[PDB]
Design a protein around this ligand. Structure first.
Ligand SMILES: Nc1ncnc2c1ncn2[C@@H]1O[C@H](COP(=O)(O)OP(=O)(O)OP(=O)(O)O)[C@@H](O)[C@H]1O
Ligand SMILES: Nc1ncnc2c1ncn2[C@@H]1O[C@H](COP(=O)(O)OP(=O)(O)OP(=O)(O)O)[C@@H](O)[C@H]1O
Ligand SMILES: Nc1ncnc2c1ncn2[C@@H]1O[C@H](COP(=O)(O)OP(=O)(O)OP(=O)(O)O)[C@@H](O)[C@H]1O
Ligand SMILES: [K+]
Ligand SMILES: [K+]
Ligand SMILES: [K+]
Ligand SMILES: [Mg+2]
Ligand SMILES: [Mg+2]
Ligand SMILES: [Mg+2]
Lengths: 527, 527, 527
């Protein structure tokens, strides 16, 4: 119902190309090892300094609506590349700008831009096939460190710390990046089953040196129902007193009467007991409770289906741990005495639960439960003297982790934009159906030189001469823009994930070739 | 979604440098002993006069958003220096402006500002290592008075009063600054356990000369629960009457029945009794009650875990004090007869509780409880004729206290900016990795002369000649800008905390070297 | 977060001096016996005509924020002088303007304004010491009348009425200024225990000539609790009827049953009784009832602590008065037959209560209770034909009362600004530490001539010649600007309180010397 403005043909295409050019010129200064940073003002406080392509892209909107349409389309390119791969958003931005510009230049009266888009997609399919042909899998942790170092803008310490984390918790393990209160980055490996619930009562502390409660070779009593009655807690204390062993009671809550009995026995006579709240807020809480019961070799009390009551507890019904530590904010369990076959059965049940999940929030919970069962988690705390530096380094650490995961799952190719440079003869071996498909193939062929040219241009040298020298060299030889020399890319460690490269190319081409099919642009009249 | 303005390169860098220069020029007039003050207009009332760098920094925002970005970044520098150290914010501001200016001057086509930032950080690490090498610990109260005098803009009385406070309550004791109703500053030492709760009933006054209640060698009855029944108070009164000794009932509250019994026994027959509310509003109330019971050698009645009732009071169960003073707004306990070993055990329990605490509010409560247990607290009341003078002097007193604590924990170096001046040959003994790292090292080397130059410039002399005369002199010789003479800085008392200097340098460098890496600035279009 | 404007140095200082000069020029026309008045527009109603310096100062705000900062600082000077002394705000304003102007003129590149402020404070301390040296105590009521006459702009009737009030109720008694419906001012002395509560029932009138209840030698029944039941009031009526004496019942309230019994006995059989609500609204009500019980020799029934009951009343328990007057809006008790020792004990208890309070509202209640127990209160009703004249005269009456109290508590010095003129040789005896302290001492030395110059300037003569003639004359000789001659100021009654002069000088100097230390002024952008 709102009044609209309508533009036709070359003027509208030039306006959207101006928007695409502005956004891509802002993004492209951050590309490569000699790329610079972008400062974006934030309304609520300190500005954000970033080297991330999708962060620069998503922070740009234009007053002109025709320019803003192209800006939003390249924003879609960068956001899709960030969601699919987690890296390569600047490459996707410059590839999309190149495809849009070369497609806008090729539109005439007799041209058919839809068939040009068809040829573009055929050429991109050929290039992706060649990229999959020339890729090799990751076999050594040195390649992991090299990938994480290249993806973190040459930071060797970030790559080394990611390699150490992947050595400790596994290449498919859980690694989480967070802030740090120190100047330097640190890696913390959390082993066993550690959850975010401390002790209910502060009188359970038997080690005042760290304000924590520690036991060795303790019984574990697991329950989903809240323990409140005297009769629900006396028999477990009777087993723990008869066998002279400590007892940790993990439950949803411990109410007043049961906690009064526990604190009275802890203080007056010296009973080794500690109460712990059950982590989770629903079905995840019961799933985690079952995981600790399986790991400790105990059964869960207050089951909704099995109906196990706390008034008849057996010594075999209690789990066992070699070590437990409970603090103010967290509790952890070490060396559970559970049966290994049941632990493995729960592990593959979690794995089969991971096969069918699309919410991308239950997937993280299942991965966390698998890590707590198998090998623990890794926490990367990013150091810095201020919040802006911490955020700037955290973006690079997240990029390096995403690229390391992509390289683990799909392999590596040559870095520096040389992987796309070696797929040009695959396009030279193509037979187009007509003239418009040939135009699209030539558009993709000219676009394939763009990332290496941008990386060389950001280093202060002429990118066309560098690209020609790379193409005239052997397949293993590329350009190192840090040292500024022509080297062996694999031996020098300049490598890229295959998934990142193909994702950036496909996501750029799909939106840019559709943008180049436009004849009429309809916008709203600015009020 | 809002429309944005995008600027590239030298114009955006010049605008950010204009904002940084404006804020730093406003801050830099307050530096040194000949620095002046800044008047900031307050909307709600009287303007604020200050000599504090972070106060001037946080009070400046610019209508130009490109200038405001640099202003916010140097605001972050000043605020981080204030949060980590509590002093040295003007030095951090001028160092950050110098690093930003010299890094903006050094950007060209072939320059790599990220490697320049790497060299800046390496040079700052070398300078911090040299500062820790040249630092010496504080060993005498004369050095404490000298540090507090230098940090309070040459006020000898503030330094003397801080030295007296640190002599009385300890160098790690609790000292609190507040306003004063008198012209002159005063120091009040609160010894023993004094809390903010007065008597419940005004009929408990036995000393009408000061409208207060005083007893000597009194029993103490401490209750975690509110005393409400008559039967909960008859046995304690019976013990106090049989032993003929005063009773101080520290409880959560006293209801109508127990209070009427207390006033009736006070007035009709002459029972020496007084009732006082338990200080605190939660877990801290029970913690303070436990510390009072441990110091007085008694037990807390109505315990949530131990379940001690007030109907079974014993003479050994009651605590003892040598003197208790009860005032309308406060009550205090002197010479508790508690066991020294249990008091020491509670003291190290509080100390170990202090080791694991990051909330920075429980830390203050634990420090206050430790001070009430060990050595009391100190209160500095700042004098003046108006609120603006009191606030202006209170800023300097807070600065002097922060610098004194920093000098206690980390030692002292030469004042007047000479400590950074003596770390230049440590940078001269550095081998850069490449040209950009060499550029960053030279940036830090030129920046290291800035604080002494600013201090000398604020004194009306040429700072470059003064700086050159300092470097041509011995390592113990610096410039006194008050006398305007070249002196021995340790013998004249012109010294600085090492922590303040390294904090200011690191916080300036970390943000300014990241600001100098910028190529594109994105701001919001002003509505 | 709001956008700010920042000004540096001489331009900012000139704008602040423009604001200070505007507000001080408006204030200074009201100074001395030949000062004029200022009309301030009020939004709600009629404009206000005043000769008060703090009233003129607080009513001025400027659109220019740089000028408004200086205006607010001189407002702070005037308000601090008004709150500390109650008089001398015009003198403080002109002294502050002089110190600000002389400090602004003396700022150069080599000047240190903080040391100038230190020298200003040292000189002001020397002048205050000389003022305390030359002060004389007040010994005669003629000096009281002279002080109150000078402070009331030469009004001899106001001074005489204040001297009469201080003669009747004491020099430290309670005197309250209020409006008058008559053309002329009047002084009313309220003796005994008069409070703002009338009788509960209009049937208690036994003297309809003034619509009042009139009894001689009456029993008094004082109750802290409400009297509602029949049996709560029958025994007291039985003692009153048996001894054949009138009964005034001062209680919190009287409910329907007891009131109906009282009115039935008053109308039918002719019982001399009257019921009166207890004055106060809380703890002050109980305190006032206790003072009435002590003064009348009775006891308070329904006390919360002692728990006295109205069902067992003894003839000695009731208080006695020689005369009680009950009026529709107020009730008074005369010739209480209480024990003199207990009255004195209550008086010293109230006196000791006054030394441990700072709320300034409980102090008024304590002083009112002490006046009702010892000497009564005085009410000055200010006459006039309109509200504007009544307010204008009430400001001068309040000024004269404040100056009379200050002269009682601290003594008197020479008026007309001659007391500050005689302190100049004390500054001539000073030895400055450096050049900036010498500058500050010279600033204060030139400032000391300002009040006499302003008083002579308002009289229409050249103030510099007058000040030179005063300084060349004897120490007892000053300038009567009212008569325009040179006289003995003590013999002519032209005297000032020492407290007012030293308060005005200290309050002016403390703010103005801090204002002259500024280099940067930060204001908000006017929206
Ligand atoms: N020393 C180097 N020499 C040559 N090329 C390099 C070097 N280091 C990195 N590269 C290449 O530079 C590219 C990395 O650029 P950059 O990480 O800034 O952008 P991106 O991966 O496209 O996107 P994002 O901004 O999301 O990280 C990769 O192609 C990588 O192979
Ligand atoms: N008499 C003096 N001679 C030379 N240098 C001095 C003298 N007194 C102090 N200084 C130096 O001046 C500096 C103190 O400046 P100032 O306290 O105004 O600023 P700051 O500490 O950087 O910041 P903040 O505004 O937060 O206090 C220190 O480097 C100190 O060593
Ligand atoms: N006849 C007189 N001859 C000379 N000086 C006089 C005479 N009468 C009063 N003065 C002086 O004039 C001053 C009184 O001025 P004024 O009361 O207007 O101002 P103030 O006390 O500074 O302030 P405020 O406006 O609060 O009253 C005093 O210094 C007093 O000694
Ligand atoms: K990038
Ligand atoms: K400063
Ligand atoms: K006046
Ligand atoms: Mg990357
Ligand atoms: Mg300081
Ligand atoms: Mg006056």
């Amino acid at each position: 119902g709102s009044a609209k403005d309508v533009k036709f043909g070359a003027d509208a295409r030039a306006l959207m190309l101006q928007g695409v050019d502005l956004l891509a010129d802002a993004v492209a200064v951050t590309m490569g090892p000699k790329g610079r940073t972008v400062i974006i003002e934030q309304s609520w406080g300190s500005p954000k300094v970033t080297k991330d392509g999708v962060t620069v892209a998503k922070s740009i909107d234009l007053k002109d609506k025709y320019k803003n349409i192209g800006a939003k389309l390249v924003q879609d390119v960068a956001n899709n590349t960030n969601e699919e791969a987690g890296d390569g958003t600047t490459t996707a931005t410059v590839l999309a700008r190149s495809i849009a510009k070369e497609g806008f230049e090729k539109i005439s009266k007799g041209a058919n831009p839809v068939e040009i888009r068809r040829g573009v997609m055929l050429a991109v399919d050929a290039v992706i096939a060649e990229l999959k042909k020339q890729s090799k899998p990751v076999t050594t942790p040195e390649e992991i460190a090299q990938v994480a170092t290249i993806s973190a803008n040459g930071d060797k310490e970030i790559g080394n710390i990611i390699s150490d984390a992947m050595k400790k918790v596994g290449r498919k393990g859980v690694i989480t990046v967070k802030d740090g209160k120190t100047l330097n980055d640190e890696l913390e490996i959390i082993e066993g089953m550690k959850f975010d619930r401390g002790y209910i009562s502060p009188y359970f502390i038997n080690t005042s040196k760290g304000q924590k409660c520690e036991f060795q070779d303790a019984y574990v009593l697991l329950s989903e129902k809240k323990i409140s009655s005297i009769q629900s807690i006396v028999p477990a204390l009777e087993i723990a007193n008869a066998h002279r062993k400590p007892l940790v009671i993990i439950a949803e809550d411990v109410d007043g009467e049961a906690l009064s009995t526990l604190v009275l026995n802890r203080l007056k006579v010296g009973l080794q007991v500690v109460a712990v709240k059950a982590p989770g807020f629903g079905d995840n809480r019961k799933n985690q409770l079952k995981d600790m019961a399986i790991a400790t070799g105990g059964a869960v009390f207050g089951e909704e289906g099995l109906t196990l009551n706390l008034e008849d507890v057996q010594p075999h019904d209690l789990g066992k741990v070699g070590e437990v530590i409970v603090t103010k904010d967290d509790a952890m369990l070490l060396k559970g005495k559970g049966d290994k076959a049941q632990i493995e059965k729960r592990i593959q049940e979690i794995i089969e639960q991971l096969d069918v999940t699309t919410s991308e929030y239950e997937k993280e919970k299942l991965n966390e439960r698998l890590a707590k069962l198998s090998d623990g988690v890794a926490v990367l705390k990013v150091g810095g003297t201020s919040d802006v530096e911490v955020n700037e380094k955290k973006d690079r650490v997240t990029d390096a982790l995403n690229a390391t995961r992509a390289a683990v799952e799909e392999g590596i190719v040559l870095g520096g934009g040389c992987a796309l440079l070696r797929c040009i003869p695959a396009l030279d071996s193509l037979t187009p159906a007509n003239e418009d498909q040939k135009i699209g193939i030539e558009i993709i062929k000219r676009t394939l030189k763009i990332p290496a040219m941008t990386i060389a241009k950001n280093a202060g040298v002429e990118g066309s001469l560098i690209v020609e020298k790379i193409m005239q060299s052997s397949s293993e030889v590329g350009y190192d823009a840090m040292a500024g020399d022509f080297v062996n890319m694999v031996e020098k460690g300049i490598i890229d994930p295959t998934k990142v490269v193909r994702t950036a190319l496909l996501d750029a081409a799909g939106v840019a070739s559709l943008l180049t099919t436009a004849e009429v642009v309809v916008t709203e009249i600015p009020k």
